[PDB]
């Protein structure tokens with residue numbers, strides 16, 4: 001599963017039944033309007049009964065989903081600017097322990113938010129489920145699981161990243177070449193999986209229901225100063241909503257290939273750098289370690305080796321195809337439904353253009 005939390009935990013200790021009940025019933029609790037009441041009446045539950053990483057991750061997912069639902073409600077503008085103490089304090093304490101900002105992140109609602117139906121059959125969409133959804137019909141299963149499946153497909157390449165760096169230091173030309181071609185292959189497979197967005201996510205539902213609950217409170221006019229995590233911090237805090245930008249897997253190929261997505265002070269680089277603060281510390285460390293290694297790009301550029309250049313450009317091109325396909329996705333799932341905005345398209349186009357500018361041959 002690469003950087004997905006392998007076999008996520010589904011159930012918390014019974015001590016947390018009141019949390020788990022709210023998170024399991026978000027669609028009708030939000031629908032009826034009883035969600036904010038059930039949060040406001042929660043006892044303050046200590047996080048000390050969360051005894052292992054898996055349970056903490058489940059608990060962070062549970063509380064993150066509750067928090068998104070509490071802040072946004074039905075998503076029609078009646079927001080809550082203060083997260084009640086009895087959830088904000090354990091959420092922030094747990095988030096501090098996991099080193100993640102106390103907002104729902106990609107690693108919660110994708111990497112930790114899934115199960116196999118049949119434990120004894122492969123990781124296919126058909127054999128999988130999400131643990132939590134926000135609203136009936138929000139297509140959170142399709143959106144989260146397809147993101148997960150694209151991540152798993154790409155994560156197969158992570159197995160090969162050590163090969164790349166050791167082939168470079170041991171000067172193993174053929175090993176470096178087959179490694180780069182295998183990475184390109186995984187990125188190409190990831191693109192095919194990517195097409196399953198159309199199979200399982202309806203554009204209307206995503207844009208008008210799901211997107212609401214992934215929104216954050218950074219630069220957000222509805223929560224202009226952030227969210228007050230009551231009884232934990234006195235002043236409100238701004239945190240970005242969930243993004244696949246927060247997947248180290250989806251940032252690591254740019255780092256690997258010396259595509260400097262995070263270089264400079266432009267907004268695209270700043271965003272992608274910022275999104276690393278929402279990755280699990282191990283994931284963020286993986287990226288930093290790649291950034292410290294010798295440049296694969298420079299290696300390939302210095303060898304006067306057309307096969308090596310070809311293998312490198314196959315990786316770069318597969319990244320370009322993913323981002324071009326993704327731009328089509330964004331057109332269909334955001335731009336079109338929004339006309340029923342351009343800062344967004346310019347971000348993705350900037351990132352794609354940085355990608356294609358790294359091609360060795362035009």
Ligand code: HEM
Nearest residue numbers: 146147150197206243244245250323329330333334344351
């Ligand atoms: C309904 C389907 C999708 C929509 C509407 C969508 C939308 C967006 C948006 C609005 C952004 C800008 C940054 C942000 O706001 O988070 C973005 C960036 C990004 N998305 Fe998606 N996305 C979708 C599916 C996916 C999937 C399945 C993946 C995983 C392969 C993905 C990977 C990324 C990545 C890695 C970025 C960062 C920019 C980049 O690396 O090119 N997106 N997407």
Ligand SMILES: Clc1cccc(-c2c[nH]cn2)c1
Nearest residue numbers: 092093095096099100101102
């Ligand atoms: Cl609890 C927690 C976990 C991770 C990051 C932060 C944070 C960063 N900046 C302000 N708060 C807070």
Ligand SMILES: Clc1cccc(-c2c[nH]cn2)c1
Nearest residue numbers: 092095096097098099100277
């Ligand atoms: Cl308050 C708090 C708790 C845990 C981690 C951090 C953090 C990470 N980076 C900057 N601050 C902050």
Ligand SMILES: Clc1cccc(-c2c[nH]cn2)c1
Nearest residue numbers: 105106110147214242243244
């Ligand atoms: Cl939180 C979350 C979960 C799955 C995918 C995304 C995403 C895709 N593109 C931008 N964000 C965000």
Ligand SMILES: Clc1cccc(-c2c[nH]cn2)c1
Nearest residue numbers: 150154190250253322323326
């Ligand atoms: Cl599988 C994969 C690996 C790296 C980046 C992307 C991607 C998709 N859309 C924007 N970036 C997808």
